[PDB]
Amino acid sequence: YDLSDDFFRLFLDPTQTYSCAYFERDDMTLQEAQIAKIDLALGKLNLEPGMTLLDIGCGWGATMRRAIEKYDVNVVGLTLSENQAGHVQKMFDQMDTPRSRRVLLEGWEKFDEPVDRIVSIGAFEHFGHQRYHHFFEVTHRTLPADGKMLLHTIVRPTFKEGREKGLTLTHELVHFTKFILAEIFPGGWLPSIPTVHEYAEKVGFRVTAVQSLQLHYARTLDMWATALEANKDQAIAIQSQTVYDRYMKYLTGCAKLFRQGYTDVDQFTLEK
Ligand SMILES: Nc1ncnc2c1ncn2[C@@H]1O[C@H](CSCC[C@H](N)C(=O)O)[C@@H](O)[C@H]1O
How far apart are CA 99 and CA 240, in angstroms? Predict the structure, then answer.
């Protein structure tokens, strides 16, 4: 099965956002910084009341809930997670708004409905390079003439290794990376910036904006680690020491990587 949600609730903030947060103010709590990230991403889609927003890889729904409440738009979210689909539908059934709200347990490969805007945060890393062209073709064909998509994903730093770029690449990296791709992003892939640009532009997309959040991810990871650690006993009771150590190793290790510049997190604004 998939890792139990009661496990995730041991380190994620209340909204259950599972992606790099945005510390607009350094004093923000994790929940405040995750709400800040949602507003940052959505603010770029120039949302207007009555529009329809597609959330590709919606997780537990915080982004779509925010879109409805703060921006007053209709939403639709796709996820591959059984637990999330059910959780988001229950969420949807509990709230009251004349806004349409739909959640679907299916990949972006099967979605083919016209929407006004698209947002995808932390999903792209799970797609795998071989499907990139398809993803951009599908998202580009569902968007309108004035459509835009906000693609938020982990990326590999560009060639700056010269006169900079901790040119170290061996063990205390290579091995960990295999660990990350095997345990954290099974069948996934971390793209280079040139690659994102490559496939996006090849379907007609114009990359009109890019924003890096490198150091915000390091602090997000630190906070998830601190929370998991404080809830160690409960984490081990619900799952196991193996899973616990697995995640602590992931969180603490990646925090170091983004902090040292080995990896980055970018938000790409793409216009049809
Ligand atoms: N091919 C695919 N199609 C649709 N959703 C996918 C997908 N591959 C991964 N996902 C989804 O993308 C999400 C990654 S975790 C991020 C969740 C949410 N965007 C947040 O910011 O918290 C999960 O919901 C996962 O099920």
Answer: 42
Q: In what order do the strands lie in the sheet with 148-155?
A: 101-105, 74-79, 52-56, 117-121, 148-155, 264-271, 206-212
CA distance 64 to 70: 10
Question: Which CATH number characterizes residue 218's domain?
Answer: 3.40.50.150
- Are the C-beta atoms of 41 and 121 separated by less than 8 Å? yes
Number of domains in the chain: 1
**254 flagged as catalytic:** yes
CA distance 223 to 220: 5
Nearest CA to ligand 1 atom 11: 57
Provide the residue range defining the domain that includes 74: 1-272
Measure the CA–CA gap between 92 and 188, rounded to whole angstroms. Answer: 29
CA-closest candidate to residue 255, choices 205, 215, 199, 207: 215
| Residue 238 CA from chain centroid, whole number | 25
Q: Which atom of ligand 1 is nearest to the CA of 17?
A: 22
Spell out the residues 6+ positions from residue 263 whose beta carbon is closer than 8 angstroms to its own.
Answer: 154, 155, 156, 157, 190, 254, 257
Alpha helices in 59-213 (DSSP H): 62-71, 82-94, 132-142, 174-179, 193-201
Q: Select which of 85, 88, 254, 257 is catalytic.
A: 254
The coordinates were experimentally obtained by X-ray
Residues 6+ apart with CB under 8 A from 235: 7, 10, 228, 243, 244
Task: For ligand 1, say whether the CB of 127 is within 6 Å of any of its atoms.
Answer: yes
